[PDB]
Amino acid sequence: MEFAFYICGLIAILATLRVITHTNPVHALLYLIISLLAISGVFFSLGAYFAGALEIIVYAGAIMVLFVFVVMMLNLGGSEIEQERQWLKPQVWIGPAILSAIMLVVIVYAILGVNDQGIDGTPISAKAVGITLFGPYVLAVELASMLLLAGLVVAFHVGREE
């Protein structure tokens, strides 16, 4: 169980790093799919089967429309990759790299300072998540439905051609 979690975590880290430092949009989307598959594998190793199930179910459709928009605008041959290459320079990425590194080491210092007892890996079924979702957490569900409705209304209002 440790092996699957650690291999999926390493794959997720590598695929995210390849995502943020790539010029090809379709290859970046493929590595993003790989990273989210690895994230769902991490979820499955921790016993949260529903979390990994929703990570593959709803993000396969999310990156699908990302592919649709990439085909819609970004694909132009080598010109788009060449234009994306000029925006990335050694100073340009070395600027915020040390900021991300110092933030990461501060958060790691924070993480290591807490007590630990180990994750037992006991599976949590979708039945318990459904009971808690429609039980103690009513208003989260209802106002999340209203939030998604609001986002849908915003998408309709902005995304019209004419």
């Binding site: 529903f50 929703l54 179910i57 709803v58 459709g61 999310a62 699908m64 429309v65 649709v68 928009f69 085909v71 819609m72 605008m73 970004l74 694909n75 132009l76 041959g77 079924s125 979708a126 039945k127 318990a128 998540v129 459904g130 009971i131 979702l133 429609f134 039980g135 009513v138 569900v141 209802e142 999340a144 439905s145 209203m146 998604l148 409705l149 986002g151 849908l152 209304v153 998408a155 309709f156 995304g159 019209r160």
Partner: protein, 129 residues
Amino acid sequence: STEVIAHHWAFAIFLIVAIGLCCLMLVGGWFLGGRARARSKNVPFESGIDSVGSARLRLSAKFYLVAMFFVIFDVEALYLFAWSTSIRESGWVGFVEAAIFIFVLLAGLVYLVRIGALDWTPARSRRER
């Protein structure tokens, strides 16, 4: 127990043999059979005449509005996935919450249908007259 590790091993062997079989038939297809040489072999197929431009042009999909609605409706679907597995223990009150949820869902769907969204077909292709 023993059944769980047996099932895990069976699933892992299923994955490994499936991927290895796909790779093996890909390798066998690539290695067997002589190659062909032609002047226009490495040209995209466009019914026998050279292309105008290339196939890497940007193509305006008309259903992008439906796509960014599809993501939202997929998330509503995941909420109903979570509800539907625990209907009996949720009780009638949980049925009331899900009824309100689904009523808001159809209200948004009727709103999308009526305002002209989910309708991207051209005027010549609307089958009028």
